[PDB]
UniProtKB/Swiss-Prot annotation, chain B:
<protein>
    <recommendedName>
        <fullName>Major capsid protein</fullName>
    </recommendedName>
</protein>
<comment type="function">
    <text>Self-assembles to form an icosahedral capsid with a T=16 symmetry, about 200 nm in diameter, and consisting of 150 hexons and 12 pentons (total of 162 capsomers). Hexons form the edges and faces of the capsid and are each composed of six MCP molecules. In contrast, one penton is found at each of the 12 vertices. Eleven of the pentons are MCP pentamers, while the last vertex is occupied by the portal complex.</text>
</comment>
<comment type="subunit">
    <text>Homomultimer. Makes the hexons and eleven out of twelve pentons. Interacts with triplex proteins 1/TRX1 and 2/TRX2; adjacent capsomers are linked together in groups of three by triplexes, heterotrimeric complexes composed of one molecule of TRX1 and two molecules of TRX2. Interacts with scaffold protein; this interaction allows efficient MCP transport to the host nucleus. Interacts with capsid vertex component 2/CVC2. Interacts with the small capsomere-interacting protein/SCP.</text>
</comment>
<comment type="similarity">
    <text>Belongs to the herpesviridae major capsid protein family.</text>
</comment>
Length: 49, 49, 49
């Protein structure tokens, strides 16, 4: 009475935001230091889990 | 092998998104300028490990 | 039965946060008086505890 549940997992990697969801939900948030590019504006390749 | 299905987990494109999606999705930053987030939908959601 | 225990510790100095994590959570915060240089964007040289 012990055993294994095997579950495969799916992670989309390096995809891209569709045309509707490109907002920020508030004005000032996720803001860089003022001489910095704000790298969240380009297509992401990283992934975190 | 029965549903021919799989499940996501908690994953995102930024550590900034991984931080605010912690304690659950009561305030999950699901999307941002190009970025995105997937909250875990699973038989394993709600559990610790 | 009143005993003893030792622990070892790790503390970082002088490191620099990676570029994806250089963000601020909100825009208007940790701002000095309006004629002052914002030294928070500098290399950290201290550590407090």
């Amino acid at each position: 009475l012990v055993g294994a549940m095997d579950l495969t997992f799916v992670l989309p990697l390096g995809l891209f935001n569709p045309a509707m969801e490109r907002f920020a939900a508030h004005a000032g948030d996720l803001v860089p230091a003022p001489g910095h590019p704000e790298p969240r504006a380009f297509p992401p390749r990283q992934l975190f889990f | 092998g029965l549903f021919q299905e799989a499940y996501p987990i908690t994953c995102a494109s930024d550590p900034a998104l991984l931080r605010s999606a912690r304690d659950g999705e009561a305030h999950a930053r699901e999307t941002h300028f190009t970025q995105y987030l997937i909250y875990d939908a699973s038989p394993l959601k709600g559990l610790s490990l």
